[PDB]
């Protein structure tokens with residue numbers, strides 16, 4: 001009796017660890033977490049982890065929730081992100097002046 | 099550079115496993131996951147796992163997001179549910 005997915009709803013423990021593919025269908029990495037607004041409970045952005053391992057030596061690319069299209073064929077999210085964009089991932093979180 | 103909490107945002111991976119306490123400050127269970135609306139990105143409810151073990155033998159209680167008040171002293175969410183409510187969990 002653990003449903004972690006419904007027709008309209010998805011569990012954060014299911015989102016976490018889901019493969020993320022680029023336009024070309026190559027795996028870039030996976031979703032490490034979603035960052036949820038403490039007040040409203042709405043997802044601000046999803047954290048795409050890539051390079052190295054989740055939690056160690058990875059980089060992070062933040063994705064708006066709506067950018068995460070689940071591709072049945074690939075069994076994961078597929079996003080519009082290019083190599084150049086990934087290369088220029090922010091060194092600090094999005095909420096930072098730099 | 100692994101941060102899972104800021105002033106305004108909490109990471110789903112930190113919310114998961116967070117202790118849940120009742121009005122009297124006694125631990126009921128913990129948050130097992132939140133369920134997010136696929137189309138809006140809004141958290142529909144968080145799943146409170148209580149009794150047995152996380153995922154195995156446990157019971158579930160759905161807590162709307164505003165129902166979760168973080169309590170620094172207790173170190174977890176404090177929620178207003180009674181034992182009789184928990185007993186009639188769907």
Ligand SMILES: [Zn+2]
Nearest residue numbers: 005010014070
């Ligand atoms: Zn799915």
Ligand SMILES: [Zn+2]
Nearest residue numbers: 032049055058
């Ligand atoms: Zn990471």
Ligand SMILES: [Zn+2]
Nearest residue numbers: 103104108168
């Ligand atoms: Zn906190």
Ligand SMILES: [Zn+2]
Nearest residue numbers: 147152153156
């Ligand atoms: Zn459970």
